[PDB]
Design a protein around this ligand. Sequence first.
Ligand SMILES: O=[N+]([O-])c1cc(N2[C@@H]3CC[C@H]2COC3)ccc1NCCCCCCN1C[C@H](O)[C@@H](O)[C@H](O)[C@H]1CO
Length: 762
Amino acid sequence: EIGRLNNQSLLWGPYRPNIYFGTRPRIGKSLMTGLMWGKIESYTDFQHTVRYTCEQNEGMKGYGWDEYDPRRGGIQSIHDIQNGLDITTSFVKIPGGAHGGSWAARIKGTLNDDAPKDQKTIVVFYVSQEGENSELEAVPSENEFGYEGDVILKGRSEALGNYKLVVTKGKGVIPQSDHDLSRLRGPGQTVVQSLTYPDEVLWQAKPILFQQLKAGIDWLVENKYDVADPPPPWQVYLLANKPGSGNVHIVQKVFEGDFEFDILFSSESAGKEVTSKDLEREVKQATEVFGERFARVFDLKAPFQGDNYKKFGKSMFSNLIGGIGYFYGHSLVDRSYAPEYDEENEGFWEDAAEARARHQEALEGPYELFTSIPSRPFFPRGFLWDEGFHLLPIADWDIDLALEIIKSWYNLMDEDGWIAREQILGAEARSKVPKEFQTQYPHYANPPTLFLVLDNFVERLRKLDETLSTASVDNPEVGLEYLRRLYPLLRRQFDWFRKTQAGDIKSYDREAYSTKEAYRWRGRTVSHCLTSGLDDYPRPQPPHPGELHVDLMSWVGVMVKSLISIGSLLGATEDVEFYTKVLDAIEHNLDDLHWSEKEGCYCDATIDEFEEHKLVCHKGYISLFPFLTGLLKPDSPKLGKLLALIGDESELWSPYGLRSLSKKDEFYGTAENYWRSPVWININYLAIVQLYNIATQDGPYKETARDLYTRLRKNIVETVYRNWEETGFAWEQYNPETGKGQRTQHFTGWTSLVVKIMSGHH
Ligand SMILES: O=[N+]([O-])c1cc(N2[C@@H]3CC[C@H]2COC3)ccc1NCCCCCCN1C[C@H](O)[C@@H](O)[C@H](O)[C@H]1CO
């Protein structure tokens, strides 16, 4: 019942973060829309200037959400240098009826100071509908060659019932052609082309548009329009009007100078149809609500209480929550469980490559996923351990939203307990991913950081849009039922980890409190360990079936501590007893297998040339894991030595945050130098939260933790703020020597954790 209200609230959104601006509902095969625009200055330039899928290069100053809440809508701003255009896309949801409500958008384009004042810009609104028993029709024009006013599309489906979608006339100069062609094509007006293609290719908006433009050009060629006397470019690239029935509708406008137009989606089962007056008003309302929620949910503490930090927090937050996508389709999975994937022998990476080279992978599904993403331009899709970080701030904002996303993720889990770490769903998603990197492998794990979110919900539980956001904490019954239904999958994931990611104690000269607790990440190559999330952090060389990884064991610890709390809430006492013994064994086994007294930190372990357990110690993030994951007692002498490592400028401590790897480590700044020195916000965030924990409890390290917490919070926030101020972007990682953001931009993305770091009061 709370489920039905949530379903209905979240159904519609701009859930296509892979494109600048578009809408889809959370339904695999339904109605989608996308925006395209580009300046036209010549006969050949439109194909190069036209924008649709997100990218980041010299031609685009920046883009992002100024404001967003997926229940209500928001405002995105796009700063396009190539096309001399500052664009604004406002989207708003209007609840009502039985079909997930109505929505509207305003597209406003303003030429920048550099653009020719008489620039011609082509704007397209592309609309598609998949589904066997559904209809969509453009109501024809009264006029001869196109539309003087609004374009109305009428459609129906099982999912949406009856609806109307209107593209309004809009404001702005419409250029007029004196050419001969105008007698056949009109002087210049809004046009509509209504087409049909087999459902599975409808997503290919750009090629479909261009095929129509080319047919347009070929008609000119056949009909004696030539270089003797050519029509203007904008008229050459203006489609001949042919509205009708189909599963594809192209709405094209040309504008000279500034422009704007509305898109009004009117769910028939609701009240009166949506108007532009409705849009303007609900835009203003949504802004007020966003304003008030922000100040309550993300109340930035000293020294970030100022307005500059507020605007920064709003940008980082809105971009993260604005990344929410709905994805649908088949994924590519190797279901061969080839025995080479067991990696039980020396040299196992060569065996595994030989297996992969059998190419037994097949598409399977379809699946759906509702998730936030790291990067609109470079990787707009679900990543398993990233989502754990993304949901930390989102959960604060709207716990029901976060729980929905968690549910969405767990619904992917297969019978054995595997969720693919990278969710590439459907041909549209695949288009952005080289074939060689699509295949998922059922023995590949990723950190279970979604348990971190679950933990915070549990603590919240112990201690209509306003209502709906917090319904899962405000009605303990609802909360518990949610945990009840998820609990088995959580448990299945726990079991899967210990089955598939088991390390080898019993087979070597290995003494420890427990014969059981030992873990090794499957999937390592000579240079990489992708499944751990820390691609190129240095690990034992060469890789070896005897390896043990202290990060993985610490994640199993995070998991088991969570199972304790959740089981304890559902009174699964047979389960809670078992967990209690596993936790106890990991605490002991962390020390017995992973602690280096001589180095003063945790290390991964291998097996020698001589068949004996060797620690292989590389000072950095990995070394801190038991502390980052909240496993050490606040009086632990090991914790204190870890605090020395963290605070030590010659090892990890840079002015800009903690270095992934110590400056003393032989691998510092080597090779791709991905996780071999740069400052990464996700691990810094875990550190900051654990420092705070120790700083707010009686113990011997209280005052040290307090100082490190104060400084690290400051350093991390200021580095990310400084870069945002100067570049407009959140970055993937930060240079510890210069403080510059580097690798990819638009990383929102766990970089956005900074809103919560500024927020404090963990
Ligand atoms: O998508 N690609 O497959 C892909 C595409 C391309 N492109 C080609 C064509 C378009 C596109 C842009 O330019 C040329 C280039 C390289 C790759 N490589 C796959 C790697 C995926 C990124 C992992 C980022 N993070 C790494 C963190 O280490 C990990 O912790 C984190 O979880 C993960 C997620 O945030």
